[PDB]
């Protein structure tokens with residue numbers, strides 16, 4: 001017959017708490033709008049969003 | 050004028066390991082979205 005797999009009995013969930021926000025809205029809604037010639041870049045890491 | 054007796058050994062292959070392959074489990078082990086497309090063929094695993 002066809003194969004089978006043992007069904008899981010629980011669920012493991014691990015995350016790092018106490019992390020600051022990324023604040024992408026504060027970067028997108030900035031009053032300093034650049035141009036395609038001098039486009040800007042900001043990297044978001046180790047944050048929640 | 051004088052003789053002795055010599056012994057020799059020889060092996061001939063007769064049997065072989067009976068290998069069975071589960072085609073459905075080999076292709077779409079634990080994924081239903083995979084089986085939904087593997088059943089669109091079916092006959093490949095059947096003939097295997």
Ligand SMILES: *[C@@H]1O[C@H](CO)[C@@H](O)[C@H](O)[C@H]1NC(C)=O
Pocket residue numbers: 026027029030031032
């Ligand atoms: C825009 O970005 C600059 C540079 O970080 C910052 O000084 C300024 O407060 C920002 N303005 C707004 C409205 O977020």
